[PDB]
């Protein structure tokens, strides 16, 4: 079926490797060939002076499909781990994820336990001077 100034022919598994005269004797030796199939490939068969196919005088196009084996290197696209997405997006923003009662007191107690001796030192020093001790404790949590 020659259309658009180009010669096309529904080649199949049968005609592979055999010269076909069409103004030249022409043949194809591809291995991925098969039946008329949705997986169809379009390319010329260039005329070659004496590749899956070389042609003699008039270059031809083929559109063989492969339903015989109708698929490699299926490398999954690296895509984000959704779990840390929330943490990262939060990491961008500023000072909306820290509410003093909810976070700052937790941090205060976690540190005061984590540094008990400095805590006692600060508490004693503050008592050496009421709520001043609590203010000093909050400040010491802040400095660290």
């Amino acid at each position: 079926r020659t259309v658009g100034d180009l010669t096309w022919l529904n080649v199949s598994t049968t005609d592979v490797g055999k010269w076909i005269r069409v103004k030249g004797e022409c043949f194809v030796t591809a291995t991925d060939v098969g039946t008329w199939c949705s997986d169809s490939v379009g390319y010329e068969c260039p005329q070659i002076a004496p590749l899956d196919c070389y042609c003699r005088n008039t270059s031809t196009y083929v559109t063989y499909g492969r339903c015989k084996n109708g698929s490699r290197s299926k490398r999954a696209i690296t895509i984000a781990p959704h779990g840390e997405a929330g943490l990262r997006v939060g990491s961008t923003k500023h000072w909306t994820s820290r509410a003093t009662p909810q976070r700052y007191l937790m941090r205060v107690e976690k540190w005061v336990l984590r540094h008990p001796l400095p805590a006692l030192v600060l508490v004693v020093l503050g008592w050496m001077m009421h709520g001043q001790r609590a203010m000093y404790i909050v400040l010491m949590l802040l400095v660290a």
Binding site: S38, V41, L51, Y54, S59, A76
Partner: protein, 488 residues
């Protein structure tokens, strides 16, 4: 149907008022009785979302067909398919050699075009704060309920409250109408979530994480897709002289599912998705609610019980009594009495129960007093007496009630304050103090005496003005608290 749930809360809406401030969560059922009015059960059924837009599609799998390649001898090859937008195409440099067929061996233009076909398309749908619906249901105790369960289906009703229409009214047959205002509060922000859709399974992922996912995607019409950047699933073979093969990478179903599964699953039904963590700061006006069958008389005939009094652990006794008798309308007596002194026990919850039809199973959920007690539910020697004992002290329950009230008050705060008018502010202040001290007042001042209580408040007021420490003036404030409880 509020017997089974956990986290029941009891709120005593002051009489002569119209405000009951509640909060509802999926697993929370509020039972409130306002004296002179029947009981409630208000319980959020399913905060869901629906009718949400379309925002994207991702092409989880790619397919190629009718690929074409045009090779030019050295000294550019273009293809007709290059204009076809449904076709992806590339221009690469390699020229057929002398053995290949061209006059001069070298590197030259190749254009390889093909049909880009998509299926298994991922579906993104952005969802807004608006267009969230919630079916609040109300069940009212004290009916006949000819079924074995004490549920007279005519005593329930359901109403949906979209934030656009914060007010809906339920029609309870003959009880009156219950109308509710409510400012919804979704927990899962609608700003940063988008409802993904795989083949058939649904999800909830960050709109950020949805956008920055790398795949071929079409923003276009639902019917037809443009597939911008459709390269991310297609690789080209080695650019051979004859042709350059093109083929997909591979379907990404498994990869995307593995990347998401550590995220909420949302079971989908009927073009609607549930939304678990949604608080609901309704206030209920129960003014248009009236008792039923308050013109009957007490029951003469007997009762029969089917099961034991099964505690629900909230300081409540629930037990499915029956009734056999000819007096087919009949208010049911219920004299909950304690082992000591024969003084009446305490708060009854299912208030003014009756029996509409001969042989109906009703549910009498009542609160027995601390100590040993006895529930007496019939006249004469036909009664069904019971033995109950409320393990646990009284003032402990009082303190627990105060703390629960503090929690509910601070939760509902933004909504539970009306600053607009002096009258509204006074009403809100009254409701606040009442909710934050109702338990302490009921327990610590029980049987003191109405006039005795008022005079105690007056004595406290005088003492507050007495010559003492300015910081010790809190006794005067205590009087104001004491006086307000005389409104109830």
């Amino acid at each position: 149907q509020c017997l089974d749930v956990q986290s029941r809360d009891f709120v005593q809406g002051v009489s002569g008022g119209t405000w009951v401030d509640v909060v509802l969560d999926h697993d929370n059922c509020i039972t409130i009785v306002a004296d002179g009015k029947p009981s409630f059960d208000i319980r959020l059924s399913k905060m869901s979302m629906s009718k949400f837009a379309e925002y994207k599609r991702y092409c989880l799998q790619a397919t190629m067909s009718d690929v074409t390649s045009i090779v030019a001898c050295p000294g550019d090859a273009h293809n007709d398919k290059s204009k076809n937008h449904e076709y992806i195409c590339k221009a690469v440099n390699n020229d057929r050699g002398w053995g290949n067929g061209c006059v001069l061996f070298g590197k030259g233009s190749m254009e390889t075009c093909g049909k880009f076909e998509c299926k298994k398309k991922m579906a993104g749908k952005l969802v807004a704060r608006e267009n969230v619906e919630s079916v609040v249901t109300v069940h009212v105790h004290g009916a006949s309920a000819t079924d074995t369960k004490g549920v007279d289906t005519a005593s329930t009703a359901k109403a949906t409250i979209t934030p656009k229409a914060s007010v809906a009214t339920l029609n309870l047959n003959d009880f009156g109408s219950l109308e509710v205002d409510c400012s919804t509060d979704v927990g899962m922000d609608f700003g940063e979530i988008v409802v993904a859709d795989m083949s058939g399974k649904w999800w909830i992922v960050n709109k950020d994480w949805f956008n920055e996912l790398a795949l071929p995607w079409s923003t276009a019409s639902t019917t037809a897709e443009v597939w911008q950047a459709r390269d991310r699933l297609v690789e080209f073979g080695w650019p051979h002289a004859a042709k350059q093969n093109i083929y997909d990478i591979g379907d990404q179903e498994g990869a995307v599912t593995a990347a998401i599964a550590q995220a909420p699953m949302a079971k989908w039904e009927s073009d609607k998705v549930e939304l678990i963590s949604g608080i609901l700061k309704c206030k209920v006006k129960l003014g248009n609610l009236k008792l039923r069958g308050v013109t009957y008389s007490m029951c003469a005939q007997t009762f029969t019980t089917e099961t034991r009094p099964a505690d629900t652990g909230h300081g409540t006794v629930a037990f499915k009594v029956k009734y056999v008798g000819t007096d087919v309308p009949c208010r049911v007596p219920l004299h909950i009495i304690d082992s000591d002194g024969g003084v009446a026990a305490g708060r009854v919850i299912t208030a003014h129960p009756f029996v509409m039809k001969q042989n109906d199973y009703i549910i009498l959920e009542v609160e027995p007093p601390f100590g040993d007690s006895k529930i007496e539910i019939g006249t004469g020697t036909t009664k069904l007496v019971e033995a109950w004992h409320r393990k646990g002290s009284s003032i402990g329950n009082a303190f627990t009630a105060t703390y629960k009230g503090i929690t509910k008050l601070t939760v509902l705060g933004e909504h539970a304050w009306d600053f607009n008018s002096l009258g509204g502010f006074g009403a809100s202040l009254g409701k606040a103090v009442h909710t934050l001290f109702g338990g302490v007042f009921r327990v610590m001042f029980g049987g003191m005496g109405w006039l005795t209580k008022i005079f105690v408040g007056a004595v406290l007021v005088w003492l507050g003005l007495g010559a003492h420490d300015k910081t010790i003036a809190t006794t005067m404030i205590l009087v104001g608290s004491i006086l307000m409880y005389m409104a109830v």
